[PDB]
Design a protein around this ligand. Structure first.
Ligand SMILES: OC(c1ccc(-c2ccc(CN3CCN(Cc4ccncc4)CC3)cc2)c(F)c1)(C(F)(F)F)C(F)(F)F
Length: 233
């Protein structure tokens, strides 16, 4: 692993992120003042859990599609067998969506960009999932305090996906090598940018993991009775 190779991996991972980040940072920021009105919030709260579930399902399905496209552009991911690609994505795609979410989160007023405007967590009341929604807002509140840059999100979410400890992998050594390469790139870039300090402030991978298991359990109990077909890209 030469300096030139490490830096090419850095630049490469950051390019794939730039091409598959669903929402441009500039828009998210300039729309921070565009907040749902009290009447609009009441409108979301009056919807049935079934309508709200299908709006969130569509929103999450779309975001997962971008995370999948992100993975496919990661050096070496496509050279993995189909089984390992699926294992990695099934275990990590929703964790990455939760990480990316902090870009759309405004720590000042505790609102998130959702269907065109910023709203607090009371927007999702109809789902009857206050505790879980609150946990998701707290998680992205923590990441916002770190001031995650776009390249830190790119490199960190690459490491969420490329994890040689996911059970079910058939080529563990090949994933281990990809993982260590990405760890090198991530650590090298933090040094270049003077951001060593965030390693210890990052959440433990078990925090993100537990958050997504509670997520998917409610996810399946919802889709068990209300399926939907979404678009592509
Ligand atoms: O698990 C449940 C659940 C219900 C709703 C959300 C949910 C949906 C949307 C948002 C706002 N988004 C976050 C993702 N961000 C992606 C992104 C960000 C930045 N750049 C590119 C892409 C766009 C903004 C927040 C939360 C959820 F996460 C889980 C429940 F808890 F209710 F049970 C379910 F499904 F069962 F209903």
């Amino acid at each position: 692993a030469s300096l030139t190779e490490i830096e090419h991996l850095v630049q490469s991972v950051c390019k794939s992120y730039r091409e598959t980040c669903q929402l441009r940072l500039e828009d998210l920021l300039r729309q921070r003042s565009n907040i749902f009105s009290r009447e609009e919030v009441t409108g979301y709260q009056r919807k049935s859990m079934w309508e709200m579930w299908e709006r969130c399902a569509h929103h999450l399905t779309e975001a997962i599609q971008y995370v999948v496209e992100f993975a496919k552009r990661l050096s070496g991911f496509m050279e993995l067998c189909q089984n390992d690609q699926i294992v990695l994505l099934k275990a990590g795609a929703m964790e990455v969506v939760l990480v990316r979410m902090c870009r759309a989160y405004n720590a000042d007023n505790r609102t998130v960009f959702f269907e065109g405007k910023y709203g607090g967590m009371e927007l999702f009341r109809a789902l009857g999932c206050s505790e879980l929604i609150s946990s998701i807002f707290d998680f992205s509140h923590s990441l916002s305090a770190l001031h995650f840059s776009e390249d830190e999100i790119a490199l960190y979410t690459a490491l969420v996906l490329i994890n040689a400890h996911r059970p079910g992998l058939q080529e563990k050594r090949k994933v281990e090598q990809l993982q260590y390469n990405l760890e090198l790139a991530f650590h090298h870039h933090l040094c270049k940018t003077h951001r060593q300090s965030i390693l210890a402030k990052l959440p433990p991978k078990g925090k993100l993991r537990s958050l997504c298991s509670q997520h998917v359990e409610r996810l399946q109990i919802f889709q068990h009775l209300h399926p939907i077909v979404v678009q592509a890209a």
